[PDB]
């Protein structure tokens, strides 16, 4: 029947996926068990014996939450006063994924605001008058690209942006997050992202970077913030995406990376954790699951004859079940896990992750798996930049028509 759709998480054998603590309790198993207990309750609320209604992505509720946040925010967001370009990006990309048009007035206002955030030394800061920082710079550039108008594109001072990147480049190949700031893999990704999109990459800008990133891959197979540190989905996404932009994916052990990320999907919850033995979280639907399309592309380039031609190498259905059933806030917006507060960051990445889980693409091969009502289908997102693929092509085409600042 079209009005009933069996779910992976609701199968009777699924109960076997519950944690086995071997009768040895530690803070880790206790916390994991608590999450699982809550998730099981949620899963059960969507099942009525043999009747299993199609899951629904609450588009309109999410839309109103996003539309409102794009203009104003409560003082609850004072903690993000140095990350306003991020709020712009998270909200615009969420609307984009939801295929919600952006009013011309709103678009121009966003452009004007991001212009005010741009530093005379290059790059963007967390707000007007703040020093530039690679994180908000990455966010601002993506936001301007989502808008995709010549007005948005031209706001970027490319000459100063390139000089700014140079001012953060370290001799070992790494980048500072900002002047006098800390260094970790996030900087390499932020720099490669904005530089490739705006066509300002010089032959020496990323010299040594690929090697520095490879040094960040550890014994686990994943990538840490800096050499020697624990593998984390966030830093692993940053590292691999940056290497893909640089066309240096081969610098990593792709085998140990693949096995590591696939292990990060939780057998019971269906979502992904950020690191081994920690908890499931909706935002990792992108940071972790997003690594599979990147790995697929990397292996494909190498002529891997065993690659799938229809699915990513993770449980696409399970991830959609976790997101749709456990990460939606009744009032609009998405989240980390049941019981947590909604925020634009989780709204952005839960949706980004849902889109990746719904769409497979490799060569001329396209295969969609949209769980629930057909309207759940989201617009596709580019695995490297996390903005629409159409937006990537349009932006790169536009900037490729401009010269690299001073060659």
């Amino acid at each position: 029947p079209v009005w009933s759709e069996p779910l992976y998480s609701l199968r009777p054998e699924h109960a076997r996926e519950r944690l086995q603590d071997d009768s040895v309790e530690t803070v880790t198993s206790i916390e994991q068990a608590k999450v699982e207990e809550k998730i099981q309750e949620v899963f059960s609320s969507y099942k009525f014996n043999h009747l299993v209604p199609r899951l629904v992505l609450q588009r309109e509720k999410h839309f109103h939450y996003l539309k409102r946040g794009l203009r104003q925010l409560t003082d609850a967001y004072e903690c993000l006063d140095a990350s306003r370009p991020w709020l712009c990006y998270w909200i615009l990309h969420s609307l984009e994924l939801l295929d919600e048009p952006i009013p011309q007035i709103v678009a121009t206002d966003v452009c004007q605001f991001l212009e005010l955030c741009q530093s005379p030394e290059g790059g963007f800061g967390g707000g007007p008058g703040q020093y530039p920082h690679l994180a908000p710079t990455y966010a601002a550039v993506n936001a301007l690209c989502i808008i995709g108008t010549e007005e948005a594109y031209d706001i970027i001072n490319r000459e100063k942006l390139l000089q700014y990147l140079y001012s953060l480049k370290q001799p070992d190949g790494s980048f500072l997050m900002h002047v006098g700031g800390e260094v970790d893999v996030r900087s390499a990704y932020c720099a490669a992202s904005v530089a490739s999109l705006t066509n300002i990459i010089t032959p020496d800008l990323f010299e040594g970077t690929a090697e520095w990133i490879a040094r960040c891959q550890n014994w686990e197979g994943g990538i840490g913030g800096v050499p020697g540190m624990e593998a984390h989905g966030g830093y692993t996404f940053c590292g691999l995406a940056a290497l893909v932009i640089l066309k240096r994916e081969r610098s990593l052990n792709l085998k140990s990376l693949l096995q590591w990320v696939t292990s990060r999907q939780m057998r019971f919850e269906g979502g992904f954790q950020g690191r081994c033995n920690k908890l499931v979280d909706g935002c990792y639907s992108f940071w972790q699951a997003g690594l599979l399309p990147l790995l697929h592309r990397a292996l494909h380039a190498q002529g891997d004859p065993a690659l799938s031609m229809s699915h990513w190498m993770f449980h696409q259905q399970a991830l959609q079940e976790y997101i749709l059933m456990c990460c939606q806030c009744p009032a609009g917006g998405l989240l980390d896990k049941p019981g947590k507060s909604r925020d634009f960051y989780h709204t952005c990445y839960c949706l980004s992750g849902l889109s990746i889980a719904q769409h497979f693409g490799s060569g001329a091969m396209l295969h969609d798996v949209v769980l629930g009502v057909p309207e759940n289908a989201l617009q596709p997102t580019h695995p490297v930049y996390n903005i629409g693929p159409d937006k990537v092509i349009q932006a790169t085409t536009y900037f490729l028509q401009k010269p690299v600042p001073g060659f």
């Binding site: 071997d22 880790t28 709103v106 020093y131 700031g181 550890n218 999907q265």
Partner: protein, 313 residues
């Protein structure tokens, strides 16, 4: 002097010692977006921080102002940079600043800026005498704090404080053997001290890990560490390991054990092993079992492995 929550706290626009400088409001434009409705105290502090910054005023009053700005938003890296500039300009006592950052991190241990500020101070002072104990306290509150562990690796490596870290690692593993951050520190310590090429060290580690596995068979961290310290040389290089895992097969099975067996078979086939056909069939059988019953969440991965094995052998 006075905190933002102190009963006698006074807004900067009301302080006589600040009457000589005009505040600089934030320019969000005529039609603002993502506009935060700041509290009066939040806006007040920042209107003055903007004035001092724009004025590049290296003063004691500006220095104290940064403390309030930080309390209002510890993630404002622009404020931290300026505070740092003032620390140098005013030749402030760094040990005093260390006591300050210590309290700040205790309140907000997951903030990037506070940890970097502390690193800078330790670098300026070239004094790591308080580091290991301070980090230990933070970790005593959250044993997996990523920034805490990162700062710890930096201090140990930069000042060569390796002597007692393995003992610290063993203590935390006793407290929670599932703490992946600790297993990572273990690899960090050994790879940077004795290394794993010393066969006596490798044996000790393999034995230690195997015992932890038998104690908590479903603890993934131990399994990952076991593969982590043997993968580079090649899992097929340790014939006894395969047999010992095979014996635990019935009375200790788990997707982790079965998966490790496939990893061994993979490496074996990659090294022209004897009974190639037999090893291949075993591996394919296990991939199917993992895909269909024991590790279904990873069905696509295991099917992929099955197909890879076939395309290679």
């Amino acid at each position: 002097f006075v905190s933002l929550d102190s009963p006698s706290y006074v807004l900067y626009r009301d302080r006589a010692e600040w009457a000589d400088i005009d505040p600089v409001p934030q320019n969000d434009g005529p039609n603002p977006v993502v506009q935060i409705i700041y509290s009066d105290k939040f806006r007040d502090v920042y209107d003055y921080f903007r004035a001092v910054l724009q004025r590049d005023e290296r003063s004691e009053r500006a220095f104290k102002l940064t403390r309030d700005a930080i309390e209002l938003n510890a993630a404002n890296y622009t404020v931290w940079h300026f505070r740092r500039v003032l620390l140098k300009s005013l030749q402030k006592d760094l040990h005093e600043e260390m006591n300050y950052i210590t309290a700040i991190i205790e309140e907000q241990p997951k903030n990037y800026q506070v940890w970097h500020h502390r690193r800078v101070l330790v670098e300026w002072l070239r004094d790591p005498s308080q580091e290991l104990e301070f980090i230990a306290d933070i970790l005593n509150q959250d044993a997996k704090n990523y920034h805490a562990w990162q700062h710890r690796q930096w201090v140990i490596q930069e000042f060569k404080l390796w002597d007692n870290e393995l003992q610290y690692v063993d203590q935390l593993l006793k407290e929670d053997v599932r703490n992946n951050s600790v297993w990572n520190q273990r690899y960090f310590v050994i790879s940077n001290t004795t290394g794993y090429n010393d066969r006596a060290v490798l044996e000790r580690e393999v034995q230690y890990t195997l015992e932890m596995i038998k104690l908590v068979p479903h603890n993934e961290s131990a399994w990952n560490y076991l593969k982590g310290i043997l993968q580079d040389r090649g899992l097929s290089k340790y014939p006894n390991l395969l047999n010992q895992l095979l014996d635990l097969q019935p009375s200790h099975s788990s997707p982790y054990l079965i998966a490790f067996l496939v990893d061994i078979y993979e490496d074996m086939l990659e090294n022209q092993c004897d009974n190639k056909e037999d090893i291949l069939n075993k591996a394919l059988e296990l991939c199917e079992i993992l895909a269909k019953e024991k590790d279904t969440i990873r069905k696509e991965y295991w099917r992929y492995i099955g197909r890879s094995l076939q395309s290679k052998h």
